[PDB]
Every structure is written in C-alpha cells, then in structure tokens.
Amino acid sequence: GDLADRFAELERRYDARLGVYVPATGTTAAIEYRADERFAFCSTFKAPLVAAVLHQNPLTHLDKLITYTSDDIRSISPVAQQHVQTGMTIGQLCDAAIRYSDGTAANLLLADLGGPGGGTAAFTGYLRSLGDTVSRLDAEEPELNRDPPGDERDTTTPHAIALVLQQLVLGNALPPDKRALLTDWMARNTTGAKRIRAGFGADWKVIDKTGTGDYGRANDIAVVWSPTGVPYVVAVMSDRAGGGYDAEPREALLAEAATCVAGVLA
C-alpha cells in the first residue's frame, strides 16, 4: 500500500492541503506527509506557549493573578471574557488557553513571557531553544490566524511542531511535574473531539490542542497512547487556501487523516 497516496486522495476529496508528522519510535516508522511544508500554527501554538511559561517560572507562578479588562478581549475567549472582574491566575490562563483555546488567555501568557512584540519574540525563542529553526510567531491573537498563504509569519511545519510536542510531553524539555500539568490540560481539552480523537478508537488515550484559522486552516496536535500504553505524537495540519480566506476548515479531514495514522499504528 502507499499511505502517501491515501493522504493525497484525502487532499483531493476535501480540496485541501494536508500535512502529517508522526515521529518514529523504537517500535514504529515515522509517518510524514508534507511534513516540512509550512502551515499556520493557529491555536496549536498555545500548547508550547503554556510550556514556555511553565519552563521559565516556578510552579508557584501558577497562582499569580492576572488582571485585564473587557478591552483586552480581542479574540475568541470563552473563559477570559467571563472573568474580567475577577482576573485569572496564570494556571487558570494555561487551562483556558489549552482547553478552550482561549485567545485572551494566550495573549496574556505571551505578555507574561515579556519582551518586544507582546511576547511573540519570546515565544519564538522558546521554540528555538527546543531546536526548532523554522517556526515563528509574529502576531498575537487573533491576527496570527489571518496571514495569507505563502507568508511565513505565524507558521510551523508538521515535523517541527511534532518534535516540539514530542520533547514537551514525552521528552525532557520540561521537568516531569511541569510536563504532567501540560499533559493534563491537553488531556482535558474540550475542542478536539472531532479531530484526531475521532480517528482513534476509544481504547486509545488522546490528548490534543486544536487550531483553526482563515483559509480553511484546521490543525490538531496530539499525543496518543495505545491500549498497551505506547505513546505516539500525531501532528495533523491542513488548510483549504485555494478556497479563499473564508474557506471552511474541515475537522473531518483531520479525523480521516488520523484514522489513516491509527491504521498504521494499530
């Protein structure tokens, strides 16, 4: 069989560009499809953003209260827009950024990293520290979802983001306590049920972070565990840029790509 052919078939069926990377393991070959092509992050960056904040702070920092105003709600923020009067702690922001893809939470965590560009330069530097020489964050939410096709701003590659996530969740980029917090937030994500999760049977554990954007962008980055406890990182990125900036993102493409991956990994 030819898995690349099957991924190409999905692209034709959905009128999409699909990128996949599943890193090789001691027991499995890599799966790679358009893995070194650029795709917009969209909200997938929020997982390594949380890691960046965890990395540079003691865990007591999760209790730091962050205050903000209604004027800070500039992007879709399901949690933050209900806590303008209370504020939210850094831990609550991490939780919201991952589990509800909260954009204000993400922007506040970017600001917590500090430096020029509201934290976007700092975040890119955190990726550089993980060996990622390609990815770049140039804008805050929501502008980071809106760059035109071909613009390298706010892009990663499936290969790069998969190896970032590998290091964060399965590797030693974070100490194991911080690692566990990231993993738990991703494990309780609320936004991913129709993406990679939908391609793996219920006996597989899936943790993930979605992203969605203009030009039909729909991404999901996950770590999955087999029914025997073997983990794999699965990065699936897509866009439908040929359809214009208002092309519909297609969750089902990601679910089907995931089902193809699940077929190989079973």
Numbering used by the authors: 27 to 57, 59 to 83, 86 to 145, 145A, 145B, 145C, 145D, 146 to 238, ...
Give the authors' words.
We investigated the roles of three conserved prolines at positions 107, 226, and 258 in the β‐lactamase BlaC from Mycobacterium tuberculosis and found that mutations can lead to dimerization of the enzyme and an overall less stable protein that is prone to aggregate over time. BlaC has 15 proline residues but only these three are 97%–99% conserved among class A β‐lactamases (Armon et al., 2001; Ashkenazy et al., 2010; Berezin et al., 2004). It was found that substitutions in all three prolines lead to an overall less stable enzyme, more prone to oligomerization and aggregation.
Pro226 is found in a loop between β‐strand 3 and an α‐helix in an α/β‐domain, interacting with Trp229, another highly conserved residue. Surprisingly, even the loop containing residue 226 displayed no changes. The absence of the pyrrolidine ring allowed for an additional ordered water to be present in a mutant structure. It is plausible that this highly conserved proline located in the loop limits protein dynamics. For Pro226 variants, T m values were about 2 degrees lower than for wild type, and for Pro258 variants, T m changes were small, indicating that both these residues are unlikely to be essential for the thermal stability.
